[PDB]
Ligand binder design. Structure first.
Ligand SMILES: Nc1nc2c(ncn2[C@@H]2O[C@H](COP(=O)(O)OP(=O)(O)O)[C@@H](O)[C@H]2O)c(=O)[nH]1
Ligand SMILES: Nc1nc2c(ncn2[C@@H]2O[C@H](COP(=O)(O)OP(=O)(O)O)[C@@H](O)[C@H]2O)c(=O)[nH]1
Ligand SMILES: [Ca+2]
Ligand SMILES: [Ca+2]
Ligand SMILES: [Mg+2]
Length: 397
């Protein structure tokens, strides 16, 4: 009994256990045995095997449901029947998941983005619910480990807990869970597809590949000619000098004030932050990318749906950078731009730049500088996030 074979079957069992209760009920048994073969046998002829398990082992059937040990036992009983099941779940002759299963072909045209379609979100909603055993709409570390049992490695670093919404204890909430998949689909779609394969998405939803979960948006250029978009996820690059408050902006989207932010650790620090934002009654995803001050602004880190140029009102040299980067990359750009006067809770000093932030915005047809602070008693104001998303949806309005 090769250890590798048992590992595959255990994962197959875990995937086939769709309600995640520990056993395979007859509904799940019919489904598995249908997709692997052809026709679910007589409901009584099903126990013509379900009692066979009962009279060899005493832990193979629990509450009229086939257990893992029973599942593994039935594998032993057969030994081609096994390889049919294995190949149906995407394994090859070396008991590894095939590249065709994990990495399906999904090529995205330039200036297009990737989102999860409606049914894909539903799968993740179901997935979340099956692993939320205490029913608190949040995934504890133990519940997360349970989820990752069908993963060859841990798919999420502990920095994810500051990229999306979490509860009091810092556990990924229901919306934070969806936000993380939304973010992953956007940035690294082939990683998302690989993870969907691990969850057995294509198998359970009975589709051609994992790529069937991904919606590929149209060219951004067309969105600007038509002057309207159908995208639900927009990316905003957050640019500003060192310690100007960029990270504070990202965590403010997650509803965390400066007090709450101070408890973030070693490698907790994320440079992305995503959450739902409502624009005129329309629910959209806002995707913030923290651009740490570097020697260069590449084409890579200046491409977005809206730019957030942040400066520090307590720093007299901070705004000069915003003006510099703007003239350099976004002055004659189709990309909307918003200037944010961060740390507004601090005393406002004079910016050493020749022109004032107000006059600068007035001169270049920008909105007036938006005052912002994350140092508040409760959750910070989400005003700038609503404005950023609005500008991303409706550029020149
Ligand atoms: N690891 C890493 N550090 C970087 C990178 N780019 C810039 N930094 C450093 O990050 C610091 C500036 O970050 P800052 O602008 O304050 O934004 P923050 O990352 O949110 O703190 C400087 O010490 C940079 O050298 C990068 O790609 N990787
Ligand atoms: N008073 C005040 N301090 C802030 C605010 N936001 C950030 N800070 C402090 O400013 C420093 C830099 O903030 P951070 O978000 O790390 O900036 P970044 O390095 O540019 O991303 C930290 O010491 C923060 O505690 C704010 O709204 N008010
Ligand atoms: Ca079950
Ligand atoms: Ca839970
Ligand atoms: Mg910094």
């Amino acid at each position: 009994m090769k250890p590798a074979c048992i590992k595959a079957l255990t994962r197959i069992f875990k995937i086939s256990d769709q309600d995640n209760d520990g056993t395979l009920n007859d509904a799940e048994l019919n489904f598995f045995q249908r997709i692997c073969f052809n026709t679910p046998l007589a409901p009584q002829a099903l126990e013509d095997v379900k009692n066979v398990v009962r009279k060899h082992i005493s832990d193979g059937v629990a509450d009229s449901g086939l257990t893992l040990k029973g599942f593994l036992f039935l594998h032993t009983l057969f030994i081609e029947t096994t390889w049919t099941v294995l190949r149906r779940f995407g394994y090859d002759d070396d008991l590894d998941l095939t590249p065709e299963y994990l990495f399906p072909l999904l090529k995205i045209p330039p200036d297009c983005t990737t989102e999860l379609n409606h049914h894909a979100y539903l799968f993740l909603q179901s997935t979340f619910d099956k692993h939320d055993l205490d029913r608190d709409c949040a995934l504890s570390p133990d519940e997360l480990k349970d989820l990752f049992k069908v993963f060859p490695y841990i798919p999420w670093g502990p920095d994810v807990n500051n990229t999306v919404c979490t509860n009091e204890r810092g556990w990924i909430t229901y919306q934070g869970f969806l936000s993380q998949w939304t973010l992953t689909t956007y940035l690294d779609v082939q990683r998302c597809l690989e993870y969907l394969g691990y969850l057995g998405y294509s198998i359970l939803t009975e589709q051609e590949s994992q790529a069937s979960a991904v919606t590929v948006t149209r060219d951004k250029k067309i969105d600007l000619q038509k002057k309207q978009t159908q995208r639900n996820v927009f990316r905003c690059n957050v640019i500003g000098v060192k310690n100007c408050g960029k990270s504070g902006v990202l965590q403010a989207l997650l509803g965390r004030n400066l007090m709450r932010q101070k408890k973030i650790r070693e490698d907790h620090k994320s440079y992305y932050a995503i959450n739902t934002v409502y624009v005129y009654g329309q629910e959209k995803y806002l995707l913030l990318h923290d651009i740490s001050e570097s020697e260069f602004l590449t084409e890579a880190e200046i491409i977005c749906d809206v730019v957030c140029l942040v400066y520090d009102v307590s720093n007299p040299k901070s705004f000069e950078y915003c003006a510099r980067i703007f003239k350099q990359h976004f002055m004659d750009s189709r990309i909307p731009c918003l200037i944010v006067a961060a740390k507004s809770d601090l005393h406002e000093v004079k910016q050493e730049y020749s022109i004032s932030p107000t006059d600068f915005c007035r001169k270049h047809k920008m909105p007036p500088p938006q005052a912002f602070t994350c140092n508040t008693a409760d959750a910070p104001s989400k005003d700038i996030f609503v404005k950023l998303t609005t500008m991303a949806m409706y550029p020149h309005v």
